[PDB]
Amino acid sequence: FTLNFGPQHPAAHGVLRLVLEMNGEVVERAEPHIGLLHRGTEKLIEYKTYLQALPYFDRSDYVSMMAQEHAYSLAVEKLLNCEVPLRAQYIRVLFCEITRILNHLLALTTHAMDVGALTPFLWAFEEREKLLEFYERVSGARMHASFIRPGGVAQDLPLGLCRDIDSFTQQFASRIDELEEMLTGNRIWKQRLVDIGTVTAQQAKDWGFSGVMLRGPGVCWDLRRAAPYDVYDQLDFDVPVGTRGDCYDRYCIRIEEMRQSLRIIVQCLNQMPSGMIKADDRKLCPPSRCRMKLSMESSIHHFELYTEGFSVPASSTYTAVEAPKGEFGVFLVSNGSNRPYRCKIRAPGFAHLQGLDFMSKHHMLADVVTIIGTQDIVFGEV
Amino acid sequence: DDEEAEQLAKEISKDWSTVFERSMNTLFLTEMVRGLSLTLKYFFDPKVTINYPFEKGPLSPRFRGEHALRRYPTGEERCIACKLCEAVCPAQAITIEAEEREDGSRRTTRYDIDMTKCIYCGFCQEACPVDAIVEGPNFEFATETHEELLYDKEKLLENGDRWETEIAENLRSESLY
Amino acid sequence: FLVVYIGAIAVLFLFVVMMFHIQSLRYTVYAGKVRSWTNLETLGNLLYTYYFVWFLVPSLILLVAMIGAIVLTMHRTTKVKRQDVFRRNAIDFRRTIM
């Protein structure tokens, strides 16, 4: 018995087009259909410079924007050998972590709105509209902040942003507590989530989950502890790791990972060195407006970096960061030219949404939206 | 194993005046009355809402909204036709054609940003050498018809003169970065 | 009649159709009106105390209806057959006999 389970609530899971082969109410197999959001991203990037390539990444995962620009930047610094300053690293993490918070605040309470709890959605989205007052203030666009450029980061924080991020972090433990007091204790929540989509660790490894769905099963594997790719080796934070694997562990993790991300934000705030914002290598970082206008040699680079590009040397690397969805890695083959060459984007949600087939076997049809909830399936990456 | 796991996870809470605690917190729905109480606290608290048309959400001088071609204080469009923004544009929205005007100084005969084919990433504002193209904080230009949304060659992007009073302010405050 | 006929029994029958389609001079005596007994009260004054065994026997008939609807329409959907497929290794040929 085949059922074309589509997007239950649009605007939350946009193009979800599962084709469930059911058995009464018990689902026997879930066959997701991809491509409804397949923009030509892995082709369009081959046609544009390494700078023009960056805006696609904030548009790859639309609920955790800067994590993908941070995964791309670290793939055009893996090749460029472009050492970025300490302040660029600290800002880059303070925003990758603000993005982890922006994602878990959505991927928890959009999940909690698919399950049925209507209010956590709107509380978490007031919180997200506080964090977009930081995105929009530091770069310009509330969602797609093309801000974490290859060398360092686009431009320094405004002169009042750390004070505001602090005044937000002080009041954010309470918001997590409310999102938690409203959902963690509920017997209507546990019942809707405990023993739902349980993934034994061998399955989370096999299906390349590598995210909050690889730390549910108990595999202690965070690419901020495994492969520290910034000040992360300096910052202190504990990676919460589940013990059962059910969608109630992944929720409890995403609601603790939203507190450890608060620890990382507070650290990045309390220790942010007053250094240069971009790599001093002005052939990888366009010089400031003031310098390119006054200096002829800076003007030449501002011209050959906003038209030509880097021309990062010939290589091929797989740089993977811990994006909120999971291990978002961008395999970036680079022909010597200024344009990338098959900038393949390993995006979790392409490996997670595979897991829907075995996660939601023998679960009731109303659980198939809870699974899609805890996978944090955002179809931009799929 | 799940059978033994159940037996043990239920033999953990197996001492009187603990079975009673759990029974009175699953019968007098007590986890749920802490949900209702929080929900009430938020029912009575002030509302984080904004009656939009009259007051609008906070922005920043770096905010990227409607593209505006700036002008030099003494008229003279700031847009010398280098085509750097036409080059840097990721979506290739800007189409620039250049002609030595009769005065002799280069200028763009055609400077058409296609707003629909535009990602509002501010690359044009960065790439332009003289700050000729900047994004005005407008962001309120929803058009009834698509053809209007294609911003014509240097005529509608020349409406930035109205927004110059705010664009000059944002630039005077952002240029420090 | 409303409840236990057109909210239960003809509900059953509707299910069996939808699925499984077939293809002046009175002298009112003002005594005994001083305390008017509603029909429920004057059925309960009897059914539960005086003729109570004809009420515990319909109890057994409702219990037999429960047992019957269970043993009939469990439809091998629970321990009736959801016990297991059942298998024994020692007797099993395991490729010795096909």
Binding site: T184, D195, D238, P240, G242, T243, C252 | - | -
Partner: peptide
């Protein structure tokens, strides 16, 4: 249906960090 029902019993909540709390 013999499908495995979602048993809503489990072990009690105990926040499980990684071993790198104090000294890696």
């Amino acid at each position: 249906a013999a499908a495995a029902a979602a048993a809503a019993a489990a072990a009690a909540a105990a926040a499980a960090a990684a071993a790198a709390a104090a000294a890696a």
